[PDB]
Design a protein around this ligand. Structure first.
Ligand SMILES: O=C(O)c1ccc2c3c1cccc3c(=O)n1c3ccccc3nc21
Length: 256
């Protein structure tokens, strides 16, 4: 309940778990990510210490004790929590989705510029702050790359948001930026339909679906044709032809 200057409170999110924490001698609330030691965590920290943008969470301090089994990362609190939960019977309106998607674009553009591939973009990792804007959270599985892009081979992140080129049975190499774009696409889809476009309780089937099922649109809710086009481009199963962030930024539906 007490970590030096911090007073741990209830859980607000959940690898590991996040709790509301009160900072005495500062008299302010913070978000405390608590992890039980049971080098990735130090890569997350390294990545975070390098990020400063209004649409990305902000690491404030790390409490590591070789003696203690627990490790704590304190972040500035993004008070309103997840923009939405999936699934949900109450999707967002187009205008709401565009608003948030714009923040997501700004944040992703920044992360890619800083040579960071998030690898876990989804509605639940987009927290709404005091001013109503989104902040990308949970870099627990992100990668840092040198060069123009990342050349990856590992399969990490949330199943329903994984890109098809990362689900080969042969462990092939694939581009990193395109992975985030694909996840942004599944995310925009969730924004207005209230559920993922590819589902299956059997992992290997989901993989097959993500890789082979053609994108389908529920006739209800009804969405503008330009939005269906944007989503279709972001969910292009071929990485080489999938729309890139610079283009998304200038798409009719986004600038509309
Ligand atoms: O970066 C992270 O891993 C992370 C994960 C979750 C949260 C957070 C994370 C990182 C920084 C901040 C938060 C955060 O403020 N919250 C929440 C606030 C209200 C309701 C739920 C919340 N969940 C988080």
């Amino acid at each position: 309940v007490q970590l030096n200057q911090y007073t741990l409170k209830d859980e607000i999110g959940k690898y590991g778990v996040v709790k509301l924490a009160y900072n005495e001698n500062d008299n302010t609330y913070y978000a405390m990510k608590v992890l039980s030691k049971k080098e990735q965590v130090y890569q997350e920290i390294a990545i975070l210490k390098k990020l400063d943008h209004p649409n990305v969470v902000k690491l404030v301090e790390v409490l590591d004790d070789p003696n203690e089994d627990h490790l704590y990362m304190v972040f500035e609190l993004v008070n309103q929590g997840p923009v939405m939960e999936v699934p949900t019977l109450k999707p967002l309106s187009e205008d709401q989705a565009r608003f948030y998607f714009q923040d997501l674009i700004k944040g992703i553009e920044y992360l890619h510029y800083q040579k960071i591939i998030h690898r876990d973009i989804k509605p639940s990792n987009l927290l709404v702050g005091e001013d109503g804007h989104i902040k990308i959270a949970d870099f627990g599985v992100s990668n840092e790359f040198k060069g123009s892009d990342a050349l990856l081979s590992n399969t990490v992140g949330t199943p329903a948001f994984m890109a098809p080129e990362s689900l080969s049975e042969t462990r092939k190499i694939f581009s990193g930026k395109a992975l985030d774009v694909w996840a942004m696409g599944v995310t925009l889809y969730c924004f207005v339909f209230g559920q993922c476009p590819f589902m299956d309780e059997r992992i290997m089937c989901l993989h097959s679906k993500i890789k082979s099922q053609a994108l389908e649109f529920p006739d209800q809710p009804d969405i503008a044709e330009d939005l269906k086009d944007l989503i279709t481009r972001m969910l292009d199963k071929n990485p080489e032809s999938r729309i890139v962030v610079p283009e998304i930024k200038l798409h009719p539906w986004v600038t509309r």
